[PDB]
Write a protein that binds this DNA or RNA. Structure first.
Lengths: 587, 242, 557
DNA sequence: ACACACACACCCACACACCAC
DNA sequence: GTGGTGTGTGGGTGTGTGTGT
């Protein structure tokens, strides 16, 4: 839905001397540069300064400053301008015009509330105020003040505790009254927010349905391979379940780049506009005759000629013959398939070689938006028995009518849901991956490895000695063992969107605490190239536009990312002797 | 397949031209996808909206009575003005008029007087003629008493009585569109926004020589999650027609 | 890219005679049928292969000095398939017998060709490169024979001459692929051919080792395995990548590795040619990607710069900055790094594939001592089920990923490792938002009954053989290339939509291999209904019970 | 692997309607 | 009289795919 966020950054000297204003500026920079890359027209931002030394306000109230008015859509240029404006204000008012003590920060909240009610008087827009204050137990908002404030605000408050220090016990008061009175109000420590904005951001791709049909075992091929309004339920001695297929494991492309041509600018700056790609066909006229001569004279010519796409036809290949098909045969050269999942049989998990799977994974789940809950029971029972007997099912899979025909393997998998109730209520679904055809198989015969023999088959020489070779390699494999890192439980590998959706597009430390301490899985690592280039772009914008730097200072990849892509160490071990006895030499 | 075979583009463009009153709808492209062997209603609508909307040029003549429109011989006339949509959007002036009408009706209900001047009258020996309209007399004006008539009236917390007669009279006197649209606009936007709030906002914006925005983002009702969406034109349907 | 096969089949009285091994199918007929199937498969898989077939010793007048050229060493052509299929049809219908075709009279003392002229012809065939076809990248000779003791076997000087000819053939890169046939009632003696065809691998004293290659594998193959051996010997090793495997970084414990794609994705019509048809002259039409300036309209291809768009801002990272940014986790060239060894019960999953696996085999041509290292690693990884978690990119222009090097089991003939790719956290999609979640769990009795019934049904359709790709031909590719084939030969295409339910079903199962097995499943369900025996009548009863349970539940809730 | 063009799915605030106590 | 729900639209956005380098 439509959302609006407002930021209040305390300028009082407690913030300024503690450098928490710099932390607030960095967090706002990250959040706004994140909002700018989407530039949604319904994403409002607005930043105020509370306990400010110099005040300029639209309602004529001192110690309240609107350093940035309401803005939508957020843009990179606007973000850079606002961030550098706030930095300039901080620089100018740091020492010579620094305030004293802690002023009345409640006054800022009232002005911000009035401005919010002016901008969003009755719209059903999620309004938000995210205040950064350095003192919670020091500021006093009395009972009348909090009552009037909670009467004025229908908006949620995200109060950030920028000042936290170690102690054997922590106690706070005062500010909790306003948070408690207003529903959906939250409190966080600022270091947690900085950690969250440091961590990589996972993709949130919406689940889009790919296939919708029936998972039928024993269905008649005459009533299922025909263009008919009704489905496979013309027979009453088969099994038929309506299911739909969603993506389950799809490869991610790198960060988007754009090819552009440099154009003019007011100050001869860099302005880049993306080019348009047009396809164009050409032929080569082979006129290349050269005149004879008694010297090096061999001049000739070779030029192409552009022709339209209308007078171009596909010449398919059959061995050594490139032929063009008549119009009628082109309609005949396509296999007319029909959507559906036709079960071929059930085989054990180890009876299907793992290298057979040849494409991206997909979900299979009972259709609930067009079918009945009887389908739900049937599908759940099938998945449960497949899991109990550890079975995989091979099926003839056609997603849509025009698509290819595939032989696919159905793997039963459970998926964990929080659900409205405390009971977790595992959800049963199949997982689909395609198996190769006769023409897909490229399996050849390779020379043997364990006990090498010559090409003719007689055994090869036993070299010098292999007794220590395997012992040293065994020690090597135990050195890097990662069995101490737990693997994600069976069911939590796939998490539903319901566990990841948030009502606000603001980076927060999140409430899903199950994902904590379950990232130890050495195989589930965040995408690293995409995050690397995203961080590089963020730092480029920061240094070269906000700090007005001159030379880029490319950051180091965080140790949190490097740890999962660098060698592991369980037991200390040196492989130098193994290298020496294995006779490894680069050629 | 997975293309649009320019003759197909011209066919769907002609079909859209035949019904200019359904160019931006969603059912028309579903019917086209039913008739066209390939492509779905969503795909056809996207194709027309992005690419073929630039080549519409003309629409075959369509009038209220009726569609299509031919000449004496029976030929098809092409016009360069597209008829309006079937869902008329609301504007600031319409909302202001509705707010004023509701405020005046509520004021009449309680104080038994209609702005600005006239007062209630009852027949004794001479009648005010037709009784369908208000039996009103302007003679006892201006009244010596002090009344909030009418800009000083505060209409908050008042939600009736209104009934069906008031909206029928509003649609007749204003000579505007259907009564259901006015009723839904009123109940879902003006009441949830505030009649006096919108009145003050409109008056203030008009005073400062600025155009006030009409009410927006005031759904106030759920989208009813848990049930199929009312209208789907994807590869699933593709409904069968006869 | 190219490849030249050369079918050389030696004729014998036993070869013409049908053998009970193939159930009264002649070994020569089996070889010819294997050739037909091989050509049919290769016209789809790899059309660049060049195939020729020669028979000897035969009495045909066409036979040039005793060798009969069924079709010469040329690129794969539809005409040669038509000729071979006509031969097969004549053999099957009984019009012409094999003896009549090859004019092989059964005397018991038939003459034989001398291997010297045979091998010179083998060398000369690969020398007469056709001007109308491209050069031969790989050269082979599929040697079929049954006479293990020819006339030249007794001599020893002409054995040296044959060795010289074999050395010339190897120097001309014409490797042999032998198909020596042995029977249960008649074993095959291997001494002569092994003597001639090997280099004589002898240990080079104490001054090092000798060449690993010695000669072709002359082990006799039973007549039961002729077709399976021919059909699986036509494939060329398609090297995907060759990236060093850096087992230990600091100590330079790095070995070479080769990567071969076990399986691919075959598409119906990607091989084509854009043709500019002008009246009667047909010629190639090429496609170019002309870039346009959206402001002026100039052809701007070749003068563009890549920029990163963040918002309404374009970041122009130069070449050096991109080089430094990329090098934080990957080098310029392909590589694979051993990160950690992990158990096989927690890393290999059947529900998280994102790509097709590759076959890893050692490479000693660039880093010495790779075969020893990887052989020891393969030995160790199995016998205690484990893997090797890798990190790198298999192509220079690609993105890194974290793989799971797994050791091949003892079942597979090939020895090596399989390289699956582990999905990133971004790539693991999210389960959709379902519209209902109370499937059957609360209803314990009904759910228990329904799942036990579904378990009963599942036991009937267990796949004893398991999935075999050879049993499933790709229907789209089959139909496309069948249309191409029967159009090229002017064979009428089959089209009909008034077909009877019996014949339309037969056509559908003839075009689709999977539909045959689906009809088999349906027939298995049907027969359980009709049969009177109680031991087999259970399947239809279980299906009917399942269908009744299916109908009940949408009414109760 | 990568950018750009294109096809199809999905959304949602809300004019416009109808129905029920 | 008045509240409740239901369909379909007007203007989009998101996601997956194909092709040439």
């Amino acid at each position: 839905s439509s959302e609006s966020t407002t930021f209040i950054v305390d300028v009082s000297p407690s913030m300024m001397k503690n450098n928490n204003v710099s932390k607030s500026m960095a967090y706002l920079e990250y959040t706004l540069l994140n909002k700018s890359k989407k530039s949604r027209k319904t994403d409002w931002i607005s930043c105020y300064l509370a306990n400010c030394p110099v005040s300029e306000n639209s309602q004529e109230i001192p110690n309240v400053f609107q350093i940035q008015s309401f803005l939508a859509p957020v843009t990179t240029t606007a973000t850079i301008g606002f961030i550098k404006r706030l930095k300039q204000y901080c620089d100018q008012h740091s020492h010579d015009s620094s305030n004293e003590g802690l002023q009345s920060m409640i006054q800022c909240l009232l002005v911000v509330s009035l401005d919010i009610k002016q901008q969003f008087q009755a719209r059903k827009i999620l309004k938000q105020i995210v205040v950064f204050t350095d003192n919670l137990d020091d500021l006093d908002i009395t009972d009348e003040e909090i009552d009037l404030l909670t009467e004025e605000l229908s908006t949620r408050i995200i109060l950030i505790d920028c000042g936290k220090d170690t102690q054997e016990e922590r106690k706070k008061s005062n500010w909790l009254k306003l948070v408690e009175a207003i529903p959906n109000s939250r409190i966080y420590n600022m270091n947690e927010l900085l950690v969250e904005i440091t961590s990589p951001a996972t993709s949130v791709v919406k689940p889009v349905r790919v296939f919708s049909g029936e998972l039928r075992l024993g269905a008649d091929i005459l009533s299922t391979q025909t263009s008919n309004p009704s489905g496979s339920m013309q027979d009453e001695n088969c099994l038929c379940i309506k299911v739909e297929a969603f993506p389950a494991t799809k490869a991610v492309s790198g960060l988007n780049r754009k090819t552009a041509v440099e154009v003019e600018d007011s100050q001869k700056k860099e302005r880049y506009v993306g080019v348009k790609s047009i396809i164009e066909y050409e032929i080569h006229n082979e006129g290349n005759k050269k005149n004879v001569s008694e010297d090096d004279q061999s001049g000739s010519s070779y030029i192409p000629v552009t022709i339209s796409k209308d007078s171009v036809t596909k010449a398919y290949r059959y061995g050594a013959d490139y032929v063009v098909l008549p119009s009628v045969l082109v309609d005949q050269t396509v296999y007319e398939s029909f959507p559906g999942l036709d079960l071929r049989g059930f085989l054990n998990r180890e009876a299907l070689p793992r290298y057979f799977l040849t494409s991206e994974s997909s979900f299979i789940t009972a259709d609930t938006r067009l079918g009945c809950q009887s389908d739900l029971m049937a599908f759940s029972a099938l998945v449960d028995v497949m899991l109990e007997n550890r079975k995989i099912a091979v099926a003839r899979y056609v997603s849509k009518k025009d698509s290819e025909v595939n032989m696919c393997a159905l793997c039963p998998v459970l998926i964990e849901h929080s659900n409205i109730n405390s009971e977790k209520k595992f959800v049963k679904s199949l997982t689909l991956c395609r198996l190769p055809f006769a023409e897909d198989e490229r399996v050849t015969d390779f020379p043997k490895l364990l006990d090498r023999t010559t090409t003719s088959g007689v055994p090869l020489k036993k070299e010098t000695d292999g007794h220590q070779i395997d012992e040293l390699m065994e020690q090597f494999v135990d050195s890097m063992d990662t069995d101490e890192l737990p693997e994600i439980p069976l069911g939590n590998y796939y998490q539903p969107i319901g566990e990841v959706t948030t009502d606000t597009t603001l980076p927060l430390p999140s409430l899903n605490k199950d994902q904590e301490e379950n990232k130890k899985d050495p195989l589930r690592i965040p995408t690293v190239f995409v995050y690397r280039q995203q961080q590089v772009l963020l730092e480029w914008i920061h240094q070269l536009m906000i700090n007005d730097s001159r030379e880029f200072e490319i950051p180091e990849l965080p140790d949190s990312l490097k740890n999962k892509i660098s060698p592991y160490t369980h037991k200390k071990f040196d492989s130098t002797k193994l290298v020496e006895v294995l006779g490894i030499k680069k050629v | 397949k997975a293309s649009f075979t320019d003759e197909e583009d011209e066919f769907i463009l002609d079909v859209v031209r035949k019904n200019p009153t359904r160019r931006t709808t969603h059912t028309l492209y579903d019917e086209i996808s039913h008739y066209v062997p390939n492509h779905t209603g969503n795909s056809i609508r996207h194709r027309f909206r992005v690419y073929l909307s630039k080549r519409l040029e003309y629409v075959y003549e369509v009038d209220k009575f009726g569609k299509l429109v031919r000449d004496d011989d029976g030929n098809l006339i092409k016009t360069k003005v597209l008829p309006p949509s079937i869902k008329r959007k609301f504007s600031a002036d319409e909302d202001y008029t509705l707010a004023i009408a509701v405020k005046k009706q509520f004021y009449r209900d309680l104080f038994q007087i209609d702005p600005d001047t006239g007062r209630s009258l009852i027949t004794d020996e001479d009648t005010p003629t037709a009784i369908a309209r208000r039996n009103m007399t302007m003679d006892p004006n201006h009244v010596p008493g002090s009344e909030p008539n009418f800009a000083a009236y505060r209409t908050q917390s008042r939600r009736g009585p209104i009934a069906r007669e008031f909206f029928k009279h509003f649609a007749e006197e204003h000579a505007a569109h259907t009564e259901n649209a006015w009723r839904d606009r009123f109940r879902k936007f003006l009441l949830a926004y505030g009649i006096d709030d919108y009145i003050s906002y409109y008056e203030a914006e008009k005073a400062q020589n600025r155009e006030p925005e009409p009410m927006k983002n005031l759904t106030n009702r759920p989208k009813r999650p848990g049930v199929p969406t009312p209208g789907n034109y994807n590869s699933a349907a593709k409904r069968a027609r006869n | 890219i190219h490849e030249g096969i050369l079918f050389c089949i030696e004729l014998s009285e036993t070869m013409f005679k049908e053998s009970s091994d193939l159930e009264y199918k002649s070994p020569l007929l089996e070889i010819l049928e294997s050739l037909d199937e091989l050509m049919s498969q290769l016209v789809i898989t790899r059309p660049g292969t060049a195939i020729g077939c020669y028979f000897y010793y035969c009495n045909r007048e066409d036979a040039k000095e005793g060798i009969y050229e069924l079709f010469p060493l040329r690129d794969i052509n539809a005409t040669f398939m038509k000729k071979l299929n006509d031969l097969l049809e004549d053999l099957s219908s009984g019009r012409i017998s094999l003896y009549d075709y090859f004019m092989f009279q059964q005397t018991g003392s038939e003459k034989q060709v001398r291997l010297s002229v045979l091998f010179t012809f083998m060398l000369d065939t690969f020398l007469e490169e056709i001007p109308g076809q491209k050069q031969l990248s790989n050269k082979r000779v599929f040697l079929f024979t049954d006479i293990d003791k020819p006339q030249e076997a007794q001599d020893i000087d002409e054995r040296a001459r044959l060795r010289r000819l074999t050395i010339d053939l190897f120097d001309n890169k014409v490797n042999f692929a032998t198909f020596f046939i042995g029977y249960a009632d008649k074993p095959f003696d291997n001494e002569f051919y092994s003597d001639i065809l090997q280099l004589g691998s002898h240990t080079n004293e104490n001054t090092g080792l000798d060449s690993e290659f010695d000669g072709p594998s002359t082990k006799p193959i039973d007549a039961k395995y002729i077709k399976s051996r021919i059909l699986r010997k036509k494939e060329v090793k398609r090297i995907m990548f060759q990236c060093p495997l850096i087992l230990d970084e600091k100590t330079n414990f790095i070995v070479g590795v080769k990567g071969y794609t076990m399986y691919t994705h075959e598409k119906a019509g990607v091989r084509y040619k854009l043709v500019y048809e002008h009246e009667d002259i047909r010629q190639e039409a090429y496609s170019k990607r002309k870039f346009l300036n959206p402001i002026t309209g100039e052809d701007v291809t070749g003068k563009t710069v890549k920029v990163y768009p963040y918002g309404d801002l374009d970041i122009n990272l130069s070449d050096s900055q991109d080089q430094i940014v990329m090098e934080a986790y990957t080098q310029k060239d392909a590589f694979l790094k051993i990160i950690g060894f992990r158990s096989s019960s927690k890393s290999i999953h059947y529900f998280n594939n994102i790509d097709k696996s590759s076959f890893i085999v050692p490479d000693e041509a660039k880093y010495e001592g790779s075969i020893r290292t990887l052989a020891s690693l393969l030995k160790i990884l199995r016998k205690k089920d484990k893997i090797a978690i890798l990190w790198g990119k298999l192509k220079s222009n690609s993105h890194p990923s974290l793989y799971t090097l797994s050791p091949s089991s003892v079942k597979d003939y090939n020895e090596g490792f399989y390289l699956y790719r582990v999905p990133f956290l971004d790539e693991i999609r999210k389960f959709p938002s379902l519209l209902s979640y109370d499937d059957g769990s609360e209803h314990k009795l009904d759910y228990d009954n329904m799942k036990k019934v579904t378990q009963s049904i599942m036991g009937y359709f267990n796949l004893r053989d398991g999935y075999n790709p050879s049993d499933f031909k790709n229907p789209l590719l089959q139909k496309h290339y069948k249309v191409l084939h029967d159009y090229l030969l002017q064979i009428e295409t089959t089209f009909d939509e008034n077909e009877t339910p019996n014949t339309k079903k037969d056509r559908m199962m003839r075009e689709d291999d999977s539909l045959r097995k689906l009809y088999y499943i349906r027939n298995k369900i049907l027969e359980s209904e009709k049969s009177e025996d109680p031991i087999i009548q259970r399947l239809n009863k279980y299906v009917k019970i399942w269908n009744m349970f299916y109908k009940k539940f949408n009414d109760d809730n």
